[PDB]
Each structure stands twice: as structure tokens, then as C-alpha cells.
């Protein structure tokens, strides 16, 4: 998104459709090399503490597509918008709305014309594909094939036996001490070839491998299955009363008003209070392991704070395996050391900061000649292009 006329057109529609918010990207929590984790629960909550945020929420992150529900008083009038600034116009409107009336009946609607509500639409199926490519099933198969050979085969067995041979064993012990220059002097060219190769052959943990290989097929059976839309709402962003008067809710505790799921709410005051309450909190998220769940997110109780991020995601080991591939655990030290959320976190922060300014524009005033709205959007869009260049696995 950098051609001027397409942006110009994109923004025009955002205005016409009366969109009044725009989701942020969410960073993983900081890694903890210390704890051997690439997105660390600990390091995520601690980050919040040291930045002066001590009242925080930990909701459960669900596998679904993000949508902002524009929940009008008259419920027929309700629409949805996406992760980007797009009215979700396809999809069955009666199927949606029925799924939406559970929620709608949790509120009193006296002189309240509209509530804007952050929600996940379920499953990823209904909306986008999200994690399914025409080339995701391909990755998944290639590894399956490679395993169902390696189990059926002479190969591993033979190799392990060469690895016991006295000829080989001495050589390998010499190669620790000799300077290649030196072992070219001692061993013949073809011995160096054969024996270094068999030494450096990557053996695979074939059970742990094959098991990971179907963490991947579970994801592919959900996608291509029958599903009716189904919402899990998690934040009230803003209420438009019928006066014209708006309430910028700014409380991630509005979750409980609209979601009966379990979640965590903590008051810390002092950092070694946190240090003390942590092991319980870990014990709790440790339970967030189901097929439903990407993992958990850490949001601060106040939904918007200056310079603070909207949340930290902390994805559980199984979902990470889908993101990173079947060799993940086997490549963990590598991947952890390569991980860098700085800059994902900077966009996560700016994005949320824009949204606040967008939300602050009155619903009343949303329109094709609100050039402060249009500016705030172009702002967001530019920063969409910036953040799109980051590590795709964040």
C-alpha cells in the first residue's frame, strides 16, 4: 500500500462506511533466554510492571479472526469490520446477527444508539484462512512423507552401526584435534568425505517428529469443516449514546460484561508482589492449551495508556509449532536467539495510539469530509505498510 490513488480510494470507503476504529498489531512478549522461551509470560508481565503499569488483565487468546462489531441499538443495523479498515460485507447476515444476539441481550439500550466492540469471530474458517495456504498442506505433507520413509528404512539403522565402527570412531576423535589441513595429510579424500558426512548427519526424533506432523493436520481438518459463525467478544471500545454524547470506555475489564470466559485480573503495586504472584499466574495460563487457543494475551487493565502497547500475546507451544514448523522444538535455541520484538512492539504501540485518536472522533462526525479522520487513517495505513515488513511470525 503506497500507490496514492488506491489509498485515496481505500480511505474514501473507510469514511463512507462509518468506521471509527482500526485494530493494531500485537507484539509477542519479550523472549526469556533465561527461561528458554521465545515469547515469555514472565518477561511480558514484568515489562508492564517496570513501565508503571501494575493493574493488568490476562485474557485467553482464541483462534479466530479479529472483528470490530459495530453493534447498533436496532440489531438489524449492526455490521462488522476487520483487522484492517474494511466493512465485512460478504458472509451471511442472518447467520451473523443470530450469533450476535446473545451479546446484544447483555446490555440495556436506553438512549444508546451504538456500542463498538472488539471481538474474535470463530473459527478462522468463517472469515479468512489465516494459517492455511495452498502451500501449508504442501509443507505438512512433505514432512509426513520424509518420516514415513525414515521409519520404513534401512537408512537410520545402517548409519548408527557405522557410527560404532572402530575405524570411524577414531577418525571422529582425531577430527576434534586436527586442523583439516592436518587431517587432509592423515586421512584420504574419500574418508574425510564419508566419515564427516555420517558424523554430521542430522538424526531425527521420529516419534516427536511424526507427532508434530499432526499438530498440523488437526489444523487442516478444522478449516475444511462445516462451521456456523460464532463470536467471542473481549473489549468495549466506545459507546455512542443517542444524545450525540460518547463514552470512551477504556477498560479491558469490560470483558466480563460481554464474555463469561475465565480471565485474570491482577493488582500489583510492588514488583516483588508480582514476583510472588507469578507462579500461580503461570499455573493458570499453563491450562490454556486447547485446540481453540493460540495461547494468552496480556493487556493492561486500562485499555489505552500513553506509550504503552495494547497487549502482549504469549502463544503456547503447540500453536507456535504451527507458526514456526515441525522442527521448532529441535530448533528452539536457534529461533529464540533470532527473535526480535523491538519494532514489532514499536508499531504495536503507535498503532494503538492512532486508534485512540480515531475512536475520539465522534461517530456523528465520521464522513468523507472529516480530513482529520482521513489523516489519522493515512497515518495508520502507512504504518500498516511499515509493520507488514516485519518478521511474519510475530
Amino acid at each position: 500500500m503506497e500507490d496514492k490513488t488506491l489509498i485515496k480510494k481505500r480511505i474514501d470507503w473507510f469514511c463512507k462506511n462509518k468506521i471509527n476504529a482500526f485494530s493494531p498489531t500485537i507484539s509477542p512478549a519479550p523472549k526469556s533466554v533465561e527461561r528458554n522461551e521465545i515469547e515469555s509470560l514472565y518477561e511480558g508481565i514484568l515489562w508492564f510492571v517496570l513501565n508503571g503499569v501494575k493493574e493488568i488483565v490476562i485474557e485467553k487468546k482464541y483462534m479466530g479472526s479479529y472483528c470490530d462489531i459495530y453493534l447498533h441499538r436496532r440489531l438489524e443495523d449492526t455490521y462488522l469490520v476487520s483487522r484492517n479498515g474494511y466493512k465485512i460485507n460478504h458472509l451471511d447476515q442472518e447467520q451473523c446477527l443470530r450469533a450476535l444476539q446473545g451479546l446484544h441481550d447483555r446490555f440495556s439500550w436506553d438512549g444508546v444508539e451504538l456500542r463498538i466492540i472488539q471481538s474474535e469471530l470463530m473459527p478462522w474458517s468463517i472469515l479468512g484462512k489465516g494459517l492455511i495456504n495452498n502451500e501449508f498442506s504442501a509443507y505438512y505433507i512433505s514432512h509426513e512423507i520424509h518420516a514415513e520413509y525414515l521409519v520404513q528404512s534401512s537408512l537410520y539403522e545402517k548409519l548408527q552401526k557405522i557410527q560404532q565402527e572402530p575405524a570411524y570412531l577414531s577418525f571422529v576423535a582425531d577430527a576434534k584435534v586436527l586442523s583439516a589441513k592436518e587431517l587432509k595429510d592423515k586421512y584420504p579424500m574419500h574418508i574425510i568425505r564419508q566419515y564427516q558426512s555420517i558424523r554430521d548427519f542430522k538424526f531425527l526424533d521420529l516419534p516427536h517428529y511424526q507427532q508434530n506432523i499432526q499438530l498440523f493436520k488437526r489444523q487442516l481438518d478444522i478449516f475444511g469443516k462445516e462451521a456456523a459463525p460464532f463470536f467471542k467478544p473481549f473489549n468495549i471500545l466506545k459507546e455512542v449514546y443517542t444524545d450525540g454524547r460518547e463514552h470512551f470506555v477504556n477498560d479491558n475489564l469490560s470483558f466480563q460484561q460481554i464474555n463469561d470466559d475465565d480471565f485474570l485480573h491482577y493488582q500489583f503495586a510492588d514488583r516483588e508482589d508480582f514476583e510472588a504472584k507469578y507462579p500461580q499466574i503461570r499455573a493458570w495460563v499453563d491450562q490454556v492449551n486447547q485446540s481453540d487457543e493460540e495461547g494468552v494475551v496480556i493487556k493492561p487493565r486500562t485499555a489505552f495508556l500513553p506509550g504503552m502497547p495494547p497487549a502482549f500475546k504469549v502463544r503456547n507451544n503447540d500453536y507456535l509449532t504451527l507458526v514456526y514448523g515441525v522442527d521448532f522444538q529441535d530448533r528452539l535455541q536457534e529461533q529464540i536467539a533470532k527473535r526480535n520484538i523491538k519494532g514489532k512492539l514499536r508499531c504495536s504501540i503507535n498503532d494503538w495510539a492512532i486508534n485512540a485518536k480515531l475512536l475520539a472522533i465522534p461517530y456523528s462526525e465520521l464522513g468523507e469530509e472529516n480530513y482529520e479522520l482521513k489523516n489519522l487513517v493515512l497515518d495508520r495505513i502507512l504504518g500498516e505498510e511499515i509493520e507488514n515488513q516485519l518478521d511474519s511470525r510475530l
Binding site: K4, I7, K8, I11, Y371, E372, K374, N375, L378
Partner: protein, 311 residues
């Protein structure tokens, strides 16, 4: 044909509105989404002077010469300019269209906001920066527009080159025919001499083509009159140069020694005391901008510029 050789010109967009009407906020989105556009803004020129708002008549007058110098420099470069209107008062708004209409297809966008939504973002603005606009100065502006809004359509007004038709002063044709020629930089190429210390002018070079105009004009009824802004003190290195090149002439007029006024106004004074009423000037040959402007604009005579002035 002519119908199909058509030329295109830079756009100037003028933003007409009360303070608070979202003039800026539009330009910010405009110059980011449209393509060949630069903004000019008066307040920013103020900030350069470290004043926050409305300053001395001194600064303010000068800032205008800057704004106009800037809008035009940009416009000449085939670059589009977006600028805030200076007011809403019809005649300054007209003054703008005069100034810039030689140069661009003008267009207008009006920011017509109701009086109290104009205060409700002027008092949410005036919490932002230091500035302030009362509920007086906003309304001289809001209604001022509603009146000049009524007696002028903010219609696009395509580039106007108005060709002041070249009309010369009316001369008594019975008088003798004559041509008038400058010395310094015209018939005499001073060539590294001091402009003002003309004591060594007998070793200047001859602008050969001008000479061949005087040498041709005197081959007819034309009297060849030389009018130099050189001091009369230096009159004898001067008619030393002239004879040297057989540039015979009927009349050499020179600047009073120790005069020192701008060389146009002494030449104009020279022209009226010594040439007008006594000659018929066919055309004049001068070099210096200031002086050719004098001849052409103040006295309406034909003046052929020989080389570049602007000094």
C-alpha cells in the same frame, strides 16, 4: 490546427476559511495523497522570525514579499502550490488572484463551518499550541466570508496571461528622427573596468552589433543621441572611445559630476530636459533592467534591451 496544440499550467489551490475551519488539516492530507504539491503558509514565515502570531507592520509587509516570491518560484518550476487565503474579505482575496493568475489555473476550496463549531475547535485548538483566537476575531471572519461568499463564485479561474498591449507615448512626428543609446553595458562593453570609476573608459570594447545599429541609423535622417549615466567628469575618456570607433553622434549627454542618484532617474531627468519636445525618438537601446523599465514603463518609449540587466 490550433485546437490541438494545447498547453497545461501549474495548479494553485487557495484555501478559503475561518481560523478553525480545518484549512490546515485538509492540506496535510492533500499534499500527501495528491502528487505535485507544495504548501505555502504564512504563519510558518512568522515562526522563522520567532514571533508566534501577528507581528509588526514591518515584518508583516516583508513576509508577504517572501510568500509571493515563494509561491511564484514554485509555480514557475511547474510545481503546484497549495496556500491558505490571506483572509475572506473579497478584495485581498482578489489581490491574490491578481498576483498569481499569470502563473496558474487557480481553484478554490471553501471551509464554511457554522459559527459555534468553529469556536469548539478553536477552543480545543487554543489548548494545543500557545495561540488564541477570541470569539470576536473569529466572527469578523465567519460572517466576512458569508458576505464575500455571496458576491463572488469560488469558480475555477484558468490561467490568465493578460497581454498589456504595447502602446507607446504619442509623439510629435514633425520633430527630427533620432535614436538614443546607453554607454555602460550597451554600446560600451566595460570589460572588467570599475562600473563607477569610468576614468579608464577609452580602453573599453565595442559592442559591435549596437555600433552597427547606430552606424546604420545615421545613414538616414536619424540623429544618434548618446545618453550615459557616467559622470561628466569622465567625458574625455568617453569621446575618446567614441571617435576611436568612428561612432559619430549628434549629441552626448552625461551625468552631472557628483550627482550619484539612481541612474534611471538622472537619465529620465536627462531625457526630458535635453531630448523631449526637440526630437522624435524611434527607439532606444539600453542594457540595465532598472533603466529599461524606466524608459518602457514610465515614459512609454520603444526600448530594445541589448544584453542582461538585473543590476
Amino acid at each position: 490546427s490550433a485546437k490541438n496544440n494545447t498547453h497545461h499550467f501549474p495548479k494553485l489551490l487557495i484555501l478559503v476559511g475561518a481560523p478553525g475551519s480545518g484549512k490546515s488539516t485538509f492540506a496535510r492530507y492533500f499534499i500527501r495523497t495528491e502528487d505535485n504539491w507544495v504548501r505555502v503558509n504564512r504563519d510558518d514565515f512568522r515562526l522563522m522570525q520567532f514571533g508566534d502570531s501577528l507581528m509588526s507592520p514591518f515584518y508583516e509587509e516583508r513576509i508577504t514579499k517572501m510568500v509571493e516570491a515563494s509561491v511564484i518560484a514554485l509555480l514557475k518550476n511547474r510545481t503546484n502550490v497549495i496556500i491558505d487565503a490571506t483572509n475572506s474579505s473579497l478584495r485581498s482575496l482578489q489581490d491574490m488572484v491578481h498576483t498569481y493568475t499569470e502563473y496558474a489555473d487557480i481553484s478554490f476550496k471553501v471551509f464554511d463551518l457554522p459559527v459555534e463549531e468553529l469556536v469548539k475547535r478553536c477552543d480545543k485548538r487554543c489548548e494545543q499550541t500557545g495561540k488564541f483566537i477570541p470569539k470576536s476575531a473569529i466572527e469578523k471572519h465567519v460572517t466576512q466570508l458569508q458576505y464575500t461568499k455571496e458576491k463572488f463564485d469560488f469558480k475555477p479561474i484558468p490561467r490568465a496571461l493578460k497581454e498589456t498591449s504595447l502602446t507607446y507615448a504619442d509623439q510629435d512626428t514633425s520633430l527630427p528622427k533620432a535614436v538614443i543609446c546607453d554607454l555602460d553595458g550597451t554600446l560600451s562593453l566595460l570589460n572588467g573596468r570599475d562600473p563607477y570609476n569610468a576614468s579608464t573608459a577609452d580602453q573599453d570594447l565595442l559592442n559591435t552589433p549596437v555600433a552597427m545599429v547606430l552606424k546604420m541609423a545615421k545613414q538616414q535622417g536619424y540623429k544618434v543621441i548618446l545618453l550615459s549615466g557616467r559622470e561628466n567628469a569622465y567625458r574625455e575618456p568617453t569621446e575618446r572611445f567614441l571617435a576611436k570607433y568612428q561612432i559619430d553622434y549628434d549629441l552626448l549627454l552625461m551625468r552631472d559630476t557628483n550627482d550619484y542618484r539612481k541612474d534611471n532617474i538622472i537619465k529620465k531627468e536627462l531625457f526630458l530636459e535635453e531630448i523631449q519636445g526637440k526630437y522624435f525618438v524611434e527607439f532606444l537601446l539600453d542594457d540595465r533592467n532598472q533603466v529599461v523599465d524606466m524608459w518602457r514603463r514610465e515614459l512609454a518609449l520603444p526600448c530594445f534591451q541589448v544584453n542582461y540587466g538585473d543590476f
